[PDB]
Each structure stands twice: as structure tokens, then as C-alpha cells.
Amino acid sequence: FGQVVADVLCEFLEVAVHLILYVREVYPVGIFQKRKKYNVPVQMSCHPELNQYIQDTLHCVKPLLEKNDVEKVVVVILDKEHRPVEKFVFEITQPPLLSHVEQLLAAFILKISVCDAVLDHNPPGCTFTVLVHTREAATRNMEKIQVIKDFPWILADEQDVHMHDPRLIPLKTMTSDILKMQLYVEERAHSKLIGDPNLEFVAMPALAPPAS
């Protein structure tokens, strides 16, 4: 059911987000402590403000996952000019065994650990943001994600979302009885009609993460 996969996914997304920040050098290696999750070595941040920022973000995603209202969670890497330079897209599906999915989840971690060998180096001084693509028909009502008053979300703009002539690097795909998920990276090369079924609700936290 929705609450079981919500717990599992948010636990996993926190780990994966921490790791992405490490391997893409968004924060210095010196803030990261090695740990083990799903029997794989991971890097977790010890920066309490960064950690709270990631937990607040995922605390707003979690009730959306519980209602099966999440299509994508995306970590965007922005260069110091605030242009997206990399996107880590977690495409999530909950169709209508845990130790099996933890082994399946572990595979995502392993592929993130090697993406720095295929992704080209990021310019210095990148920051990150998170995008959430929801599932239900798109309207301007944000109330379902505004679950923390002091952690506001704002609707994303085309510039926030759509990468410029992107190189596509899939990392990992899983299929399970209760969860299907695809992780891929978009790397920068370096009609708007109301009835359009491609219309999307996409939101990002208004607050920026702690500077590095």
C-alpha cells in the first residue's frame, strides 16, 4: 500500500540525495561521513542544516507518495549562474519482497557511486534544488505539497526544469511487485493549450539549501 512504499522510498531518497551531493561535489567531501545502507558504502552529510533541508523536502513528498501522487523526484544541479547543469530524475510508479527491493534499491546506490566516471566534471560552485512532478491533473492549487508552512514550495518554470540539449545517461531501472522506478541523468551539453494532456504540475522548494 501507499504508506509502506512511502516509508521505503523516502528513506532511500534521502540516502540517494546525500550521495548525489557527494559524488557530484556540490558540498565539500569534508562534510560527509561514510556509512553503510542496503549493505553498500554511502556518504551521508553531517551538516545539520543541509540534513534538515533534505528531510523537510522529503516530508512534503511523503504524503504525496502515500496517495500515489508522485511521478518524479528530481535532484537538479545548478551552476553558479543558476542554470541547471545536471538532473537526476527518479521516475516512480506504484502499480495498483522488502529484502528484494532493498537489494534492488542497493543497485541504484551502486550506479550513483560510478556516475562520476561517465558524467563530465561540474563547474565549481554548483548548488542544488529538488523538483517534484505529481500525478493528478495539473492545476495551480499547491495545497497538497504545502504541508510545512515555513518550508514553502513554488511552481517551477520552464527554465527550472528543461535541460538544454541534454545528454541522457540512464543509471538504474527496477521492477518490483509494489514499486517500479527508473533513475537517469540529463547532463547539459556544456503550444501551451489548457487541454494538453502533457500539462504538468511541477514544484520546487522556494527556500534554497545551505550554501557550501
From Swiss-Prot:
Changing residue 75 to E: In FANCV; drastically reduced protein abundance. GO terms for biological process: actin filament organization; cell division; DNA damage response, signal transduction resulting in transcription; double-strand break repair; error-prone translesion synthesis; mitotic spindle assembly checkpoint signaling; negative regulation of canonical Wnt signaling pathway; negative regulation of cell-cell adhesion mediated by cadherin. Residues 11-137 are annotated as: Mediates interaction with REV1 and REV3L and homodimerization. InterPro entries: HORMA_dom, HORMA_dom_sf, Mad2-like. It comes from the Eukaryota. It is found in: Nucleus; Cytoplasm, Cytoskeleton, Spindle; Cytoplasm; Chromosome. Keywords: Cell cycle, Cell division, Chromosome, Cytoplasm, Cytoskeleton, Disease variant, DNA damage, DNA repair, Fanconi anemia, Mitosis, Nucleus, Transcription, Transcription regulation. Changing residue 168 to A: Significantly prevents interaction with REV1; no effect on interaction with REV3L. One of its GO terms (molecular function) is JUN kinase binding. Changing residue 53 to A: Alters interaction with REV3L. Loss of interaction with REV3L. The keyword Plastid does not apply. Ubiquitously expressed. Its main location: nucleus. GO terms for cellular component: chromatin; chromosome; cytoplasm; nucleoplasm; nucleus; site of double-strand break; spindle; zeta DNA polymerase complex. Changing residue 182 to A: Significantly prevents interaction with REV1; no effect on interaction with REV3L. Residues 3-185 form the HORMA domain. Residues 132-190 are annotated as: Mediates interaction with ipaB. Adapter protein able to interact with different proteins and involved in different biological processes. Mediates the interaction between the error-prone DNA polymerase zeta catalytic subunit REV3L and the inserter polymerase REV1, thereby mediating the second polymerase switching in translesion DNA synthesis. Translesion DNA synthesis releases the replication blockade of replicative polymerases, stalled in presence of DNA lesions. Component of the shieldin complex, which plays an important role in repair of DNA double-stranded breaks (DSBs). Homooligomer. Heterodimer with REV3L. This dimer forms the minimal DNA polymerase zeta complex (Pol-zeta2), with REV3L bearing DNA polymerase catalytic activity, although its activity is very low in this context. Component of the tetrameric Pol-zeta complex (Pol-zeta4), which consists of REV3L, MAD2L2, POLD2 and POLD3; Pol-zeta4 is the fully active form of DNA polymerase zeta. Component of the shieldin complex, consisting of SHLD1, SHLD2, SHLD3 and MAD2L2/REV7. It is linked to Fanconi anemia, complementation group V: A disorder affecting all bone marrow elements and resulting in anemia, leukopenia and thrombopenia. It is associated with cardiac, renal and limb malformations, dermal pigmentary changes, and a predisposition to the development of malignancies. At the cellular level it is associated with hypersensitivity to DNA-damaging agents, chromosomal instability (increased chromosome breakage) and defective DNA repair. This is Mitotic spindle assembly checkpoint protein MAD2B.
